Amino acid sequence: WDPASGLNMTESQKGKPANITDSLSNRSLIVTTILEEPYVLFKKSDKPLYGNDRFEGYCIDLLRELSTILGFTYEIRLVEDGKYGAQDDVNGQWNGMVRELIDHKADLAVAPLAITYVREKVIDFSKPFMTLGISILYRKPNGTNPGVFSF
Amino acid sequence: QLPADTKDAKPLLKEMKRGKEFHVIFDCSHEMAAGILKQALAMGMMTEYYH
Amino acid sequence: TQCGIWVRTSNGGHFASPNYPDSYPPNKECIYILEAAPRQRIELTFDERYYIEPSFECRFDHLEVRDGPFGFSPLIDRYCGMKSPALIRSTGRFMWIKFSSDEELEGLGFRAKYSFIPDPDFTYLGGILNPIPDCQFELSGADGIVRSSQVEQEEKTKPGQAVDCIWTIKATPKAKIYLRFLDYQMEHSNECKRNFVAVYDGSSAIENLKAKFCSTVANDV
Amino acid sequence: LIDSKGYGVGTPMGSPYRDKITIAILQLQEEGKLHMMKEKWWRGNGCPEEE
Ligand SMILES: *[C@@H]1O[C@H](CO)[C@@H](O[C@@H]2O[C@H](CO)[C@@H](O[C@@H]3O[C@H](CO[C@H]4O[C@H](CO)[C@@H](O)[C@H](O)[C@@H]4O)[C@@H](O)[C@H](O[C@H]4O[C@H](CO)[C@@H](O)[C@H](O)[C@@H]4O)[C@@H]3O)[C@H](O)[C@H]2NC(C)=O)[C@H](O)[C@H]1NC(C)=O
């Protein structure tokens, strides 16, 4: 002690006799997803609401319903490269989410991943939660200017 | 504690008015008790809530 | 209404309390600035007489002389004592001085100076020191298209450099202000360390945040 | 379509033949055989009538 200084305690908090790392505690699953309407969207808020709370959509609600029914803690991390992932040229690398899954920077891929042949050899998928295909847009039939002999 | 030098205990009474303390057990001589009791009037701390 | 001797014919330096030498009244929020002639910096030294209400960690009154004409702009010192001030500077011509006053507080005031023409040494925007436009332009009126692209029209900076533009919507006298966001989009949504839009009040002090619109949506104030 | 079920080649509980048929099935969807096999058997014997 010193009246100019104060309490300068020399018990400066060295290494504690309790030091245990985690491998199964939660590990906080780093769920890689991409931002596409209406699957994953940002919240429409004004205050700085962040963490996992800033996301919104259908595909977020799937991850929340899995967290209750399987008991884990999800942590949404958006992919740095905005692609899903595709087989490259002579390079032969993956680019986007499927690259994050191989690199094990992503324990999960809760997103619109189209289950296909070149992704199944390289990563694995759960069974489909939504089935789709290729369909047609067209004009809805209008007020029908009928021709001119419509009488 | 009152300040030792001055008779100006207005820095004290501004705290007590703000600190919601309505019951005081002053230990002063009657020379200094008159001086606080005038400065407790100029502070408006002499309503019917005090004792 | 507010503070008294204010005259600025290169200004000399005589910024004083609004009764000095007397007892200044309760409840004043005088808002001193001095930001012209970009060479000279800062010297307060409120000359010899000095008594404002001495509180325990000062708590009632202050003479905050934070540099740059706002409340966010960095703090220099708090003053509440009965002992003469600290004779200071902060490397720049930018200032903001408040004179808060709660209810039961009196005794003396101040009277200032600046008495300076120095200059700093290192470059900031390009040149010897480049006393940067403290990114700003005032606008009055009854309708604004107050824009972040007047920066893109005239930034007075280099593209790729951090921006700090503040407006000052005045009035049409004896009224209020209704702001509403027509367009609003930030680059890093929900980040709030490197981007935000904030609306204070009158008298730009840090204890006057009405709103700090930083995430995806901004509504009216 | 009200519900969405799905048929599927089964396997015992824990087997390599779950995964290596999944590779094989997904090829037949994209090659077009698995649709062509559907139009061999589910195609009817002369309904057309042009409605
Ligand atoms: C004999 O010794 C010295 C000089 O030789 C004189 O000063 C006394 O000792 C210390 C000075 O360091 C004083 O205690 C400190 O007061 C600080 C507050 O000061 C403000 O308020 C007082 C009135 O209360 C004003 O006088 C002053 O100008 C300021 O406005 C506190 O902040 C200090 O608290 C903390 O300080 C450090 C941490 O940085 C540590 O010591 C502690 O952790 C502590 O929490 C501290 O309380 C002391 O009050 C001085 N005495 C008096 C009477 O004021 C002696 O006065 C001198 N003479 C005698 C007779 O002893």
Ligand SMILES: *[C@@H]1O[C@H](CO)[C@@H](O[C@@H]2O[C@H](CO)[C@@H](O)[C@H](O)[C@H]2NC(C)=O)[C@H](O)[C@H]1NC(C)=O
């Ligand atoms: C506060 O406590 C520290 C802890 O001992 C004091 O001393 C240190 O002394 C070593 C020895 O050279 C130096 O590395 C530093 O000067 C001190 N700090 C640390 C972190 O090592 C220190 O002197 C005390 N403070 C004062 C003002 O006396």
